[PDB]
Amino acid sequence: STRCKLARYLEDLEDVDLKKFKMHLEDYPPQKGCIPLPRGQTEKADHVDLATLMIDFNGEEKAWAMAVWIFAAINRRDLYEKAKRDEPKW
């Protein structure tokens, strides 16, 4: 269900946005308690599978935080504010 909420935001990424979102995942800055994702599985993953991959690598709460940060970073402030206002009660 977190997985499905995240998949829905990811389906809203334009092609350029998705490429950049995936780079950020693969290259995630290394002092958060977050683990970057492998390039093969990340590049290959469709939208729902990418949400699943994010949760499998980092768990629900961190995957959500990563998604919020990256949305801001790639200037999708709409998805940044939507995920922030649609954050699960952990």
Q: Which residues contact 2 (CB under 8 A, 6 or more apart)?
A: 55, 60, 63, 64, 88
Residue found by looking up tokens 């709460």 in the block: 61
HEC string of 29-85 equals CCCCCCCCCCHHHHHHCCHHHHHHHHHHHHCHHHHHHHHHHHHHHCCCHHHHHHHHH
DSSP state of 86: T
Domain of 90 in residue numbering reads as 1-90
Q: Which two tokens stand for residue 63?
A: 């995957």
Q: Which residues of 48-75 are buried (b: 16+ CB within 10 A; e: fewer)?
A: ebbbbbbbebbeeebbbbbbbbbbeebe
Long-range pairs for 25-31: beta carbons < 8 A, 24 or more residues apart: 25/54, 25/66, 25/70, 28/66
The span from the CA of 38 to the CA of 57, in Å, is: 10
DSSP state of 89: -
Q: Which residues contact 11 (CB under 8 A, 6 or more apart)?
A: 47
Considering only CA atoms, which of 70, 57, 48 is closest in space to residue 2? 48
Cβ of 16: how many Cβ atoms within 10 Å? Answer: 9
Q: How was this structure determined?
A: X-ray
CATH number at residue 72: 1.10.533.10
Domains contained in the chain, number: 1
